[PDB]
Every structure is written in structure tokens, then in C-alpha cells.
Amino acid sequence: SGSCLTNNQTGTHDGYYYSFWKDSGNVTFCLQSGGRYTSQWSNINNWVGGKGWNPGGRRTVTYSGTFNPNGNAYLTLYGWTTNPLVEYYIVDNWGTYRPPGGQGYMGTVNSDGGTYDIYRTQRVNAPCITGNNCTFWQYWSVRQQRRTGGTITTGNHFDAWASLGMNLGQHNYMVMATEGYQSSGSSDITVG
């Protein structure tokens, strides 16, 4: 049994941690069975959410499902660390915009049968886990080719990032998320 959420919320469902956040707009985030969740969004500015773990860390994440963006949206492992404060992404799929627009390219890393471009970008006046209006660095791993489903060996990415001076702090949550920006669409993802 699961409920569909329309307001920001975090918790645990069917053994999996989940985080659902948006600054404004309409998103229906449904807690399906096990590690599954579905989402449908529209009339939004920004939103991100999914099922996963808290805390995150080195892990072989397995996920599957569908991703149907109508504009700008990402299908990505998403998490945070503190001290330092970092927002990280391991993007497997995207819509009309491939993040982060090539900004802050650092190199590449091979993992789970694919090659990912690595980027590091800074954010300002942005919401973060420790409050609102924060500034912090974002670490990115973006697949060179779109994919919807497979394994994501987080350690492979964390290590490449570290080698490039992109160090992580104490792990907070880590989920297989769907993110949207001024767009609409849907997703159906099961994590393990």
C-alpha cells in the first residue's frame, strides 16, 4: 500500500528511503511497492525526488523503469553530503537539456558499461539540505549516451571525482531520482 504525495516530504516506504521536493508547481509522487515510485509533473519551476537510501555511500544501485520527459528533466542518482556541503548527480538520462550544459568539464569515468562526462559547478541562492538560500558545489557524472535502467556503482564515480579534487563529505540521502525544470512529464522507477 502506498499514497501519492503532492507536498514536500521525506521518509521510509517499503524499506526504502524516499525524498520528494519541489519549490513550486504540481507533482504527484506515488510511493509504489518495494523500491518503486512513479511521478508526474507539470506547471513547475523545479522538483526532484526518488527512492533510495539514507545515508548513501558506496553501493551497487540497480534500477529499472520508464522515463518520459516533456522538456527539461533528468533521470539520475541524486544525493548530498555535508562538510563539505555537496549536491551530486550520476545522470543516466535527460530531456531537452543535457546537464550541466558542458559547464565545468573535468574529465571522464567508465562505469557500468558506459562512459560518463564529469563536471563540477557552483550554485548560489539555492535550496540545500541544510536550509534555503545556500551556496555549494555540484559534482556531476553524465552518461555520454542516454540510458534508462541498469546498475550504478557509486564508488566508481566517487573515486573518479576524488581524483579530480571533488571530495565528498559525510553522506546524507542518496536516491534514484527524477528531476524536472519548467517542464512536464512522467517517470516510473524501481530501485534496488
C-alpha cell at 65: 523503469
Strand partners, 110: 115
C-alpha cell at 101: 550544459
Helix (H, G, I), strand (E, B) or coil at 1: coil
The rounded distance, in Å, linking the Cα atoms of 76 and 34 is: 19
Alpha-carbon distance values, 129 to 28, 134, 192 (Å): 21, 9, 24
The rounded distance, in Å, linking the Cα atoms of 142 and 48 is: 17
Strand partners, 41: 27, 185
Rg (CA), the chain: 15
Alpha-carbon distance values, 166 to 35, 87, 108, 159, 175 (Å): 29, 11, 13, 9, 20
Is residue 179 annotated as part of the catalytic site, yes or no?
yes
C-alpha cell at 98: 543535457
Contact 5, 30 (CB under 8 A): yes
Q: Which domains does the chain have, with CATH numbers?
A: 4-191 (2.60.120.180)
The rounded distance, in Å, linking the Cα atoms of 105 and 117 is: 7
106: left (phi over 0), alpha (psi -120 to 50) or beta: alpha
Of 74, 87, 88, 166, catalytic: 87
DSSP structure string for 7-35: S-EEEEETTEEEEEEESSSEEEEEE-STT
For β-strands 105-111 and 16-22, DSSP reports them as unpaired
According to DSSP, residue 64 is labeled E
Is residue 87 annotated as part of the catalytic site, yes or no?
yes
- For 155, how many CA atoms within 13 A lie in the half-sphere containing its CB? 3
Resolution of the model in angstroms: 1.5
The rounded distance, in Å, linking the Cα atoms of 85 and 123 is: 11
C-alpha cell at 96: 531537452
Sign of CA dihedral 44, 81, 122, 108: negative
Of 95, 172, 179, 189, catalytic: 179
C-alpha cell at 55: 545515508
Report which of 30, 54, 50 is spatially closest to residue 40, judged by C-alpha positions.
30
What approach was used to elucidate this structure?
Answer: X-ray
